[PDB]
Design a protein around this ligand. Structure first.
Ligand SMILES: O=C(O)/C=C/c1ccccc1
Ligand SMILES: O=C(O)/C=C/c1ccccc1
Lengths: 655, 653
């Protein structure tokens, strides 16, 4: 009882609008909240002392007292991992030595194969999840450690944490704990990337290092904070890219001359996968009384019995293809949010019933498996995009458009978007390779204690990487689409001048109505791009057609006029045509190189790309290289700037 | 609301209670209905005319009238696929030539790699779904063609169809169409192995070859019928096997001596993935007041500070592990059921509004992708199992159990379940490899008209294969668990006689009360399976411990020494003569009472009693194969669901 596009539209709004994240043990932190924190520095964290303070302090004292007495708890008085036989009564040194041994990652320096440290955005996200995790009053951590976390987030201090080492996130989390207790070997960023030792970093925000109490080290390092924080920003992005490609399907339909009936509600009602009904519903709305669908209907009414009666699968099958994709992206979002709003930690303190409970809430498998799913789904979005792209580039499938979307009339010096077409293959290829699962590679780890482990963080990173290739593919697809709209609008303007030339030239030469009828039919029916390079060349389809209609016309007539006179006028026709035709077509084209899109639901995307990002029809005469144009679009997608035209486009779809 | 375990119990009930599958275009066909049609031959199809004949006939008539007066629509007057440019008014033979071109699969003969045709259960399931898919009245197929499908189904006639060729299911469907039009080159089974050419098969059930009318060829061949039929039976199995392994996690707890607290509701309340809450809920109920959990806590109270305080992950993290798996299996079931109950076909006839709608309901992507997901989840189920099984085999982790669950005291001639142990690594490895996605290998097909295609049937087959490996692992896991229960029960009886012998021997010999106490404690604490092989060996853990205690004692008592040594000496003489014989007598008795109080009793009785097995040892002549084979094919049969239900009897809500 919703519709995923309202939900995603909902995420986008929360992302730009939110100023304050409420962390209080009760109000849900959403995936858009995590992304906003990571990405927008004006958004601050608010730990609400009125909510959780007391239940956090009751849990704090309960573990204080107790481990201090006899009490045999896994966290406080026991050894760790496969070493849980080792009991001890030295609470503070047990805790600090655990942090010490986990400080075991490695930083890279000139890494060709990957970033050589975990990004600050994800480290900060992880800080938020750890804090939030504590608000359930289940950890036994002190309230001040929590305040400290809050203040580090708000001042933009974060530890530098190694990319690898988590099997899901002891090691990564030890770098937060290390910062907190001021371990000199841990380096920390303060805003400007500027770097200092942890104790100096605590200094600059008015903190002193902590001495860990019983259970505090464990509560700090036990958790899925890194995997989940990253899966959160991954999911946010997957929702908006998803909505992005769905939307771009409607733009593809317009430029390729599709038949919008593929999206008719009865097709989908009768095969009612929610993702299929909802993506179709959106596409139907997008294409309703589009001016390009009118150009399309025109196109298939001319020589109807000679053109494909159906579109190819990349268009007509888009909703059926999108359905599982939207469904896995959507419920993966629900499950990572559930993780985000959980006490992931061990043991779990039940102070009400006076006991510690030994479980495994640190196990990140919910996220790890769902990351494997979404990476497969994004690979599928990429295959959608690559197929559409492919269709657009090939004249036998693009229904009138030139091969490679190449414009400049001389095709021997204009190879159009052929370089992008090649990159799309490269992009998609790498993308499919990345969608193999990570969860199938579990090793029995930590003295065979962790015989089952999620690899959540490794999987999130690979899905993170799949998304980045998707952005490249969308950037290219979108720029090709804009290129296609210009060619569609020029196509139409060229067809008119050819009609006007043929007509006014039939008039001047005294040609009969019969002859004029056929010649004009040809002028309307033959696609210009098949002959734009040399309009008067007898081997190209225009004159091929015209000359055929002349013979057919002299044959129908010849009897009660004069056959000899007809040929003379026809020769004069051809000669005037060799004088005027190419000239008129050129001027119309030159004029176009500095109107139907103006009425389309995709105007926002065309306008954004053409004049907000300042680009133009691609040709041998525009100085910009394909890189320069796609770069701009890509930067807009990477930035979030692409959501402005996306929301303008979807404005008032509601329901 | 809800609860996956209730849903799955619900499927098992439907599976063996249903008699008649209702096909009427309104009442849901469930994944259990497909599996029962496939597997039980007493279940028949009921094509229900009163419910859907009328929209089928109206649609049928619309097509016919659109075609008979000319003459432009994709199904009925156009060329197919990449040749949609081709218009013709030669409607019957157009349909004929479409089937002809799609009869393009290949049968294998002695294939080693694969079965070399699609199995009859899968083919019949496809027939059912193709039938159901026509009930919505969107296809234009004649009612009589549907009645023929019901008849063939109810008469166990089906075409032989090649395993491969679908990109998702033109080719495989062409063979069903090929039967219906009595094409001589397509061969059909009638029940008992026996094969006949299609024309003779129709003849045997009172049918005549159909001559196809406009749209009918397309209507038969356009569709997701084979992919979805396979995914349905796959999904049915994925549900019962899921439940089986969740339940087995509780049996593992019992035999490995775990702490049941890992399943405590507060732990999961606070990390609330429905699958984790729901699996922990089952586990909590299964282990509540368990007589084996009593032994576990009894075990951790002696020498507690030398024994681990937490269980390893395969047990303790099982709810967190299962959560994603139950969720993906559970909602892949919903999505295949949605497919089962849809008009997959093109064009869709909206006779109500006088138009043919051109789309792609034939595109089985929903199924294809969810099959890639389930395959990975069953890989996770297997990893859970392999880990539990590994822990059980290793003395350092099994908490008193002998390495390899090896019984017979003489270990140099008893290597236990080591063969199964090795097999389990082989199963898991292949399973993990199977879980790579198929949907990432989409090729641009059919003159680049199908530039996107689901590969759903191929994906369904690989998930099918994954599940088959999963059955092997559960079979071995289960039979290791029963072996383990016998060992735990024997262990208990053995420790009593050791305590008994030491005690009464200490008296016969007149040992001081301080010495007797220390000797008894050692008998309580030392795990028997560390010395069962040679109880009186000084270098083994018993005598070693006793001899220390005797030294501790003689130092402590200076409050007479020479005679205390004489009495200690006689103690060893006597222990040597009596201890092994007594343990052996008890062991022998045990070979042809705590499980009788276990909720896992039904599994133990079933395996031990109904399948007629015993404790594995050097003197039972049966091989491991022979015992696991019986468990395996009770799992393969569905017979394993009787003990499963008996085990969950009362779980309710
Ligand atoms: O919670 C557990 O069982 C394990 C905790 C741990 C902590 C540090 C290192 C290894 C394991
Ligand atoms: O709907 C389509 O595009 C094509 C269906 C089809 C039918 C037979 C052979 C190939 C394609």
């Amino acid at each position: 009882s919703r519709s995923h596009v309202k939900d995603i539209l909902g995420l986008i709004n929360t992302f730009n609008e939110v100023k304050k994240i409420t962390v209080d043990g009760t109000t849900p932190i959403t995936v858009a909240h995590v992304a906003a924190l990571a990405r927008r520095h004006d958004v601050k964290v608010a730990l609400e002392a009125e909510q959780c303070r007391a239940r956090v302090e009751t849990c704090s004292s309960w573990v204080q007292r107790k481990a201090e007495d006899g009490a045999d708890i896994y966290g406080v008085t026991t050894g760790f991992g496969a070493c849980s036989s080792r009991r001890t009564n030295q609470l503070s040194e047990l805790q600090e030595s655990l942090i010490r041994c986990l400080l075991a990652g490695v930083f890279t320096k000139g890494c060709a194969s990957s970033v050589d440290e975990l990004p600050a955005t994800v480290t900060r996200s992880a800080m938020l999840l750890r804090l939030n995790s504590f608000t359930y009053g289940c950890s036994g951590i002190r309230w001040e450690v929590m305040e400290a976390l809050e203040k580090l987030l708000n001042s933009n201090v974060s530890p530098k944490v190694p990319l690898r080492g988590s099997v899901s996130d002891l090691i990564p989390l030890a770098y937060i704990a290390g910062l907190l207790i001021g371990k000199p070997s841990v380096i920390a960023r303060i805003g400007d990337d500027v770097e200092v030792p942890a104790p100096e970093a605590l200094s600059r925000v008015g903190l002193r290092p902590f001495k860990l109490q019983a259970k505090e080290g464990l509560a700090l390092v036990n958790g899925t904070s890194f995997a989940t924080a990253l899966a959160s920003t991954v999911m946010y992005d997957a929702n908006v890219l998803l909505l992005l490609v769905e939307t771009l399907c409607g733009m593809f339909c317009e430029v390729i001359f599709g038949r919008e009936e593929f999206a008719h509600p009865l097709i989908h009602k009768v095969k009612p996968h929610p993702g299929q009904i909802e993506s179709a519903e959106l596409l139907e709305w997008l294409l309703r009384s589009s001016p390009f669908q009118d150009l399309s209907r025109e196109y298939y009414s001319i020589d109807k019995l000679k053109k494909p009666k159906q579109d190819r699968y990349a268009l007509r099958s888009s909703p059926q293809w999108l359905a599982p994709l939207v469904q896995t992206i959507r419920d993966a979002t629900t499950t990572v949010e559930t993780e985000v709003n959980s006490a992931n930690d061990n043991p779990i303190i039940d102070h009400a019933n006076d006991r510690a409970l030994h479980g495994a809430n640190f196990q990140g498998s919910a996220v790890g498996f769902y990351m494997d799913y979404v990476r497969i789904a994004v690979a599928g979005l990429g295959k959608l995009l690559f197929a559409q792209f492919t269709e657009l580039m090939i004249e036998y499938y693009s229904n009138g458009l030139p091969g490679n979307l190449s414009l400049g009339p001389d095709l021997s010096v204009d190879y159009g978007l052929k370089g992008l077409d090649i990159a799309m293959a490269a992009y998609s290829s790498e993308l499919q390779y990345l969608a193999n699962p990570v969860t199938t590679h579990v090793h029995s780890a930590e003295q065979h204690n962790q015989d089952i482990n999620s690899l959540a963080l490794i999987s999130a990173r690979k899905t993170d990487e799949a998304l980045d290739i998707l952005k490249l593919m969308i950037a290219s697809h979108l720029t090709a689409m804009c290129q296609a709209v210009d060619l569609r609008q020029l196509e139409e303007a060229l067809v008119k001048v050819v009609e006007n030339v043929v007509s006014t030239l039939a008039d001047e030469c005294g040609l009969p109505n019969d002859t004029k009828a056929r010649l004009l039919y040809v002028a309307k029916a033959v696609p210009v791009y098949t002959y734009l390079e040399s309009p008067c060349d007898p081997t190209l389809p225009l004159l091929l057609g015209l000359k055929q209609s002349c013979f057919g016309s002299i044959l129908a007539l010849h009897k009660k006029i004069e056959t000899d006179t007809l040929v003379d006028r026809l020769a004069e026709f051809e000669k005037r045509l060799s004088d005027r035709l190419e000239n008129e077509m050129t001027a119309v084209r030159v004029l176009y190189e500095k109107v139907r899109i103006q009425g389309s639901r995709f105007l926002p995307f065309y306008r954004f790309v053409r004049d907000e990002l300042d680009t133009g029809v691609m040709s041998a005469r525009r100085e910009q290289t394909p890189q320069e144009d796609v770069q701009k679009v890509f930067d807009a997608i990477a930035d979030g700037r692409i959501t402005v035209p996306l929301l303008h486009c979807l404005q008032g779809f509601l329901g």
